[PDB]
Design a protein around this ligand. Structure first.
Ligand code: PXP
Length: 228
């Protein structure tokens, strides 16, 4: 693999997908999903221009984070995008800049209470289980309003929007409709809540549908770093 080459290609596809549907490419944030890839591979991405990285497992994330802190690398943004058990919340709160997987209030409160006061608030997204009946992550859409309100008062967090890991679909129509469900909910949150600007939605194979539907952040793993 040439990570630098993949980055530019993915970025071209992102830019193509945004322009094709009348969006500025500036609206879509590329989040490089570096789970199960060595810090050397992240380094190749960092050198090529990538600054935003997503990790699914806490210790693996912190190692990579501590590592690039020691090298002195600036302007990085680390998103934790895997499920978050209670006993591993302290590590996420101390080292990450974003968490995409808030799906119950006890975990949000722990993250709030373990977040060092010198750090800016942890940017958090509420995860919706929009279409996956084999998953236990994410709330139902009916729960969004209540959970968003509870989480919105936590002063060491900053509620920024919604995330969803849709059940896998092959039909492009279903990818788009499911993503549109999320964008509608995102839209509705934004009419009421301050600084709702992030809809984390779309991976390597449903990128186009997700961007057409209104996603602001795609989470690309395979098309950048190869397979896992
Ligand atoms: C939460 C999350 N986002 C993004 C990805 C990236 O998927 P892909 O490799 O197809 O780009 C993954 C892979 O597990 C993921 O779990």
């Amino acid at each position: 693999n040439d990570i630098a080459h993949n980055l530019a290609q993915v970025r071209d596809k992102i830019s193509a997908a945004a322009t094709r549907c009348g969006r500025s490419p500036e609206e879509i944030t590329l989040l490089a999903v570096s789970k199960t890839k060595p810090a050397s591979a992240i380094a190749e991405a960092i050198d090529a221009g990538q600054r935003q990285f997503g990790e699914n497992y806490v210790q693996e994330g912190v190692d990579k984070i501590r590592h690039f802190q020691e090298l002195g690398v600036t302007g990085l943004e680390w998103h934790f995008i895997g499920p978050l058990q209670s006993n591993k919340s302290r590590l996420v709160a101390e080292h990450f800049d974003w968490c995409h997987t808030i799906d119950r209030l006890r975990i949000a409160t722990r993250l709030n209470d373990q977040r060092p006061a010198e750090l800016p608030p942890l940017n958090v997204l509420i995860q919706i289980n929009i279409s996956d009946e084999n998953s236990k992550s994410g709330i139902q859409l009916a729960e969004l309003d209540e959970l968003a309100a509870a989480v919105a008062e936590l002063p060491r967090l900053r509620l920024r929007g919604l995330m969803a890991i849709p059940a896998p679909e092959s039909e492009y129509v279903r990818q788009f409709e499911v993503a549109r469900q999320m964008a509608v909910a995102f839209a509705g949150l934004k009419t009421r809540y301050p600084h709702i600007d992030t809809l984390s939605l779309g991976m390597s194979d449903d990128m186009e549908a997700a961007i057409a539907a209104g996603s602001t952040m795609v989470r690309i793993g395979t098309a950048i770093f190869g397979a896992r």
